[PDB]
């Protein structure tokens, strides 16, 4: 039930929480854009990010653990449940202007977290924290048991 | 490498008839992105007809063409198809397959260079070539203008080129007439008074439809 | 509701090299910045310029610029170039079906230039298919409006003419225009004279060129 955590190499995570298993990667590669996909401004809006209930309150609990204020921090992008392309809930944590304070805040909860937790963001560069739930296109191969079972 | 959409070539079919035409594509991942497909014919802008995601091979239709237009993709071939039933001459057209970016933002990013479609009981006919020549009492300027006659072929299109493609700057290619089911056009090109009739100067034909190559080499007349 | 339907206004529109010109685009509902460009080139090529109202694609030259909110949408062209000449689509991205306007297509303005005429009798290849078409070439000139008349023997004659014109020049933003009038053999061979006579703007006789069948 209580969600588990594991960290495959320096920027591939998981969570596994109840049936769901998730896909963390930090990475300087976003693939949304405020523009098209969703802004997430309270936790009721990560349903829209997830199709199943069930994998909400993972979320909803992660990011709390991460540090994130929904009062006060900027909001998570997510892509819309209703695309073919999957589930993919991001954390801008740049290590540049407008989320220098964030970013690190967010990656002292990945630190808490995982404990070999590894920082790749590049002063003056774009950071995310991306999360797809496995068995969505947007995980690809990455939640295969050749994986899965490296982790655990 | 780069992205490319390759559509197939251009098809006459009769009335009545059925006719499928496909959109191959390379350079990205043809599972995750829509494949569109748009509508053009002259004076009536641009009509979308649906889209298909290769990915799963979910179809959304533009309610205009449901029944006209079928779509399917071949994920193994990164292949998109559109096949058309019961045509009619208000489905003479090009089609232009476009796909979207990956996270389906409705803007196309990449379009292939389209497919003519005509539909017409008029039957395949190749051209004639006829060279066009100054009159034997014509006078000699600096430049001289030459050109060909491409006479009463069906359907379109035609490709004129000069010298093999080697005469290109000074080349007009004027749109072809329809008259009679038949279709004419002509084609001029200019060249310095010095190089013609020193240096020979030939166009080329080609017909696709009917199979047909010409090279027609421009004497003067005696 | 219905479908949202893309005006353009314009359909057609000239500017001299390095005018602004601005393109307008309504659509009849609310689309929320879901509006996207396209080119397309006299070679029927089509090219993404703009989305989302006024975001560049790699590669689109700072010229292009759009601008627009809610129903009313521009694009505008600075410092027009040479190779902008195309026609441009605006397209609503809000929700489907999609639908485009219907075009706008963009012409350049230069100085005038009369047509250089030439003339060709048929070749004895087309003698022998029965057929006798003589050619007229308008080539380079501007602006567009032309008038052609054949004469044969003095007489004015329209029946057999077919006129086509080519799209502007890329290069030099001139129009030509190709003027066949097709007799059969037969009637080619009652005649003497085939005349092309072209009434343009830059001069106030017609340019005349000729043909006589006896050589
Ligand atoms: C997660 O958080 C991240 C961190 O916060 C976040 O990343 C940050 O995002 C912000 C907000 O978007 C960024 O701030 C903006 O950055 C924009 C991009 O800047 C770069 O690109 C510019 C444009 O480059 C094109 O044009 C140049 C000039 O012609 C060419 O030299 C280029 O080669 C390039 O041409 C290419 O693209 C063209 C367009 O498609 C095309 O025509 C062409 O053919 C070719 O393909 C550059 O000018 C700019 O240069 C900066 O840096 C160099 C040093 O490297 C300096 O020398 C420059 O002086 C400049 O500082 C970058 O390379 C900027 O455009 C943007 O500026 C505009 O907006 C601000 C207000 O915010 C204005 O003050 C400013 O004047 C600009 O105004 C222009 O745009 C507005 C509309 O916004 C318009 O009204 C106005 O009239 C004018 O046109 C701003 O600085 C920030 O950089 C990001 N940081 C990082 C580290 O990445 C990230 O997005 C978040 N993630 C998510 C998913 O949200
Ligand atoms: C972690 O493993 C995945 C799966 O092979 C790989 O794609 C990724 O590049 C790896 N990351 C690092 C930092 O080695
Ligand atoms: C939700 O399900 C639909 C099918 O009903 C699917 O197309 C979509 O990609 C799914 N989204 C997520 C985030 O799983
Ligand atoms: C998600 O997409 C649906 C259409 O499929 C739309 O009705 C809904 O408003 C979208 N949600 C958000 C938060 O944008």
Same mark, same amino acid.
């Given at each position: 039930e209580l969600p588990s955590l594991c960290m495959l190499n320096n920027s591939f995570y998981y969570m596994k929480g109840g049936a769901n298993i998730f896909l963390i990667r930090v990475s300087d590669v976003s693939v949304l854009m405020k523009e098209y996909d969703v802004s997430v401004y309270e936790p009721e809006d990560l349903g829209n990010c997830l199709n199943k209930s069930d994998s909400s309150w993972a979320i909803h609990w992660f990011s709390i653990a991460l540090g994130? !204020?929904?009062?006060? !921090?900027p909001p998570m992008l997510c892509r819309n449940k209703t695309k073919k392309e999957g589930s993919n809930i991001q954390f801008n944590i740049s290590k540049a202007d407008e989320s220098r304070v964030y970013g690190k805040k967010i990656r002292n909860g990945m630190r808490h977290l995982f404990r070999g937790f590894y920082d790749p963001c590049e002063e003056g560069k774009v950071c995310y924290v991306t999360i797809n739930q496995c068995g969505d296109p947007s995980s690809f191969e990455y939640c295969g048991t050749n994986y899965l079972s490296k982790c655990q | 490498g780069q992205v490319q959409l390759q559509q197939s070539g251009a098809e006459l079919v009769k009335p009545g008839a059925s006719v499928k035409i496909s959109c191959k594509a390379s350079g990205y991942a043809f599972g995750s992105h829509w494949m569109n497909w748009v509508k053009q014919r002259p004076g009536k802008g641009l009509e979308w007809i649906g889209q298909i995601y290769p990915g799963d091979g979910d179809t959304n239709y533009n309610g205009k063409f449901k029944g006209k237009a079928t779509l399917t993709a071949d994920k193994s071939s990164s292949t998109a198809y559109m096949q058309f039933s019961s045509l009619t001459s208000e489905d003479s057209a090009v089609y232009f397959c476009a796909r979207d970016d990956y996270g389906t933002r409705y803007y196309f990013d990449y379009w292939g260079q389209g497919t003519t479609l005509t539909v017409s009981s008029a039957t395949t006919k190749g051209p004639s070539v006829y060279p066009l020549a100054p009159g034997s009492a014509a006078q000699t300027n600096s430049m001289v203008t030459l050109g060909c006659l491409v006479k009463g072929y069906f359907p379109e299109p035609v490709t004129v080129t000069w010298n093999s493609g080697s005469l290109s700057s000074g080349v007009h290619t004027f749109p072809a007439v329809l008259q009679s089911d038949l279709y004419t056009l002509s084609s001029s090109v200019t060249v310095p008074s010095s190089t013609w009739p020193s240096q020979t100067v030939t166009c080329n034909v080609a017909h696709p439809a009917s199979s047909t190559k010409v090279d027609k080499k421009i004497v003067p007349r005696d | 509701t219905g479908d949202i339907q893309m005006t353009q206004t314009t359909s057609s529109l000239s500017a001299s090299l390095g005018d602004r010109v601005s393109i307008s685009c309504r659509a009849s509902q609310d689309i929320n910045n879901y509006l996207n460009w396209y080119q397309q080139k006299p070679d029927g090529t089509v090219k993404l310029l703009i989305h989302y109202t006024s975001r560049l694609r790699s590669g689109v030259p700072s010229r292009f610029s759009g601008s627009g909110f809610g129903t009313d949408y521009s694009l505008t062209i600075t410092n027009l170039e040479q190779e902008d000449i195309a026609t441009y689509f605006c397209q609503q991205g809000k929700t489907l079906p999609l639908t485009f306007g219907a075009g706008t297509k963009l012409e350049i303005k230069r100085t005038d230039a009369a047509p250089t005429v030439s003339i060709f009798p048929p070749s004895s290849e087309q003698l022998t298919s029965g057929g006798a078409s003589v050619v007229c070439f308008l080539n380079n000139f501007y602006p567009k409006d032309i008038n052609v008349k054949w004469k044969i023997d003095g007489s004015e004659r329209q029946n057999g003419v077919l006129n086509s014109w080519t799209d502007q020049d890329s290069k030099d933003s001139t129009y030509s225009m190709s003027s066949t009038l097709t007799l059969t053999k037969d009637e080619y061979e009652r005649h003497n004279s085939y005349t092309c006579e072209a009434t343009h703007? /830059?001069? /106030?006789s017609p340019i005349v060129k000729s043909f006589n069948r006896n050589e």
């Open positions: 994130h !204020d929904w009062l006060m !921090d | - | 703007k /830059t001069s /106030t």
